Amino acid sequence: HHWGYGKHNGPEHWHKDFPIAKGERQSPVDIDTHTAKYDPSLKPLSVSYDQATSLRILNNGHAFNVEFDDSQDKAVLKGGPLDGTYRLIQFHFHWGSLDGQGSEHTVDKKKYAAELHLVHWNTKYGDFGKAVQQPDGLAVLGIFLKVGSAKPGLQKVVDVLDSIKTKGKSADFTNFDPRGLLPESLDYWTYPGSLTTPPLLECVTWIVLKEPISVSSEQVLKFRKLNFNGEGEPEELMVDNWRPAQPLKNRQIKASFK
Numbered sequence: 570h571h572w573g574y575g576k577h578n579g580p581e582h583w584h585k586d587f588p589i590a591k592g593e594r595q596s597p598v599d600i601d602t603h604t605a606k607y608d609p610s611l612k613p614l615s616v617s618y619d620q621a622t623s624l625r626i627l628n629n630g631h632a633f634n635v636e637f638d639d640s641q642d643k644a645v646l647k648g649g650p651l652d653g654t655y656r657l658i659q660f661h662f663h664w665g666s667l668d669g670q671g672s673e674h675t676v677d678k679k680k681y682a683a684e685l686h687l688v689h690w691n692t693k694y695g696d697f698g699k700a701v702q703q704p705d706g707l708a709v710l711g712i713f714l715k716v717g718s719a720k721p722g723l724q725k726v727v728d729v730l731d732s733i734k735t736k737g738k739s740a741d742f743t744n745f746d747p748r749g750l751l752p753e754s755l756d757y758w759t760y761p762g763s764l765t766t767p768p769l770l771e772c773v774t775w776i777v778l779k780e781p782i783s784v785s786s787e788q789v790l791k792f793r794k795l796n797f798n799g800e801g802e803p804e805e806l807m808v809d810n811w812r813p814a815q816p817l818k819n820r821q822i823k824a825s826f827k
C-alpha cells in the first residue's frame with residue numbers, strides 16, 4: 570500500500586484499500602464536551618511507566634515511532650475503562666504545518682498543534698499483531714500539544730530528529746522516560762474506536778487526556794523539518810500527518826471527571 574496524507578493518497582482515499590475506513594467505530598472523533606457523560610463507574614487510571622525500556626526511534630515515512638521493549642510488563646496502562654493489563658509498545662505524534670492544526674481528536678471542534686499517541690496492547694492476546702485483531706486489543710493514550718513553554722521531557726526526542734530526517738532512518742533511543750511527556754492531570758475522555766492510520770482496525774479503547782501539554786515553538790518547528798520522503802528523493806516536509814474527525818455514529822464518549 571502507498572497511503573499518506575497528500576491530495577492523491579490522503580485520508581479521503583484510504584477507504585479504497587481499507588474499507589473499514591467507513592466503519593462504525595472509526596477514529597479520531599470530535600469530543601463534544603457538553604454531551605460527554607461523566608461515568609462514576611470508571612476505575613482509577615494507572616499509568617505505570619517506571620520500568621519503561623525504550624529501544625529505538627524510527628521515521629516510517631508517516632510519522633516517527635519511539636519503540637519500547639514489550640516482552641515483559643515494564644510499562645503498562647491499567648484501570649480507567651480497561652480490563653486487564655496493556656503494555657506500552659510505541660509512541661508517535663501527529664502534527665500540523667501551522668499551530669492551529671495537527672491534532673486528530675478535537676475538543677468542541679478545537680484543533681491543537683499536535684497530538685501524542687502512546688500505544689498499548691492487551692497482554693491477554695500475547696502479542697501486538699494478535700491484539701490488533703481484537704475489539705479490545707489496544708489502548709491508546711492521546712495527549713494534546715499546544716504551543717507555549719517548552720516540554721523538557723520532549724527535548725531528547727527533538728534533539729535526535731536530525732538523525733532520522735528521512736523515511737527508513739532509525740537511531741538508538743535507549744533510556745527514554747515517557748513519564749516526561751504527561752500533563753499534571755490524568756482526567757480523560759474515553760470511547761471505543763480505531764487506529765487512525767491504515768489499516769484503521771477497530772481495536773482501540775481511546776483514552777484522551779483533558780489537559781494538553783505545552784511545547785515550545787522551537788520544539789514543534791523541529792517536527793516540521795522531518796521528511797516524508799526517503800534520502801535522495803525530492804523533499805516533502807513531514808507536516809499535517811493527521812486524519813480529521815470521523816462520524817461518531819453509535820458511540821457515547823464518557824468522561825472521568827465531572
Ligand SMILES: COc1ccc(/C(C)=C/C(=O)O)cc1
Nearest residue numbers: 686688701764765766767768
Ligand atoms: C497491522 O499493522 C499496524 C499498523 C499500524 C498500527 C498503528 C498503531 C496505527 C496507528 O497508530 O493508528 C498498528 C498495526
Ligand SMILES: [Zn+2]
Nearest residue numbers: 661663686765
Ligand atoms: Zn497516532
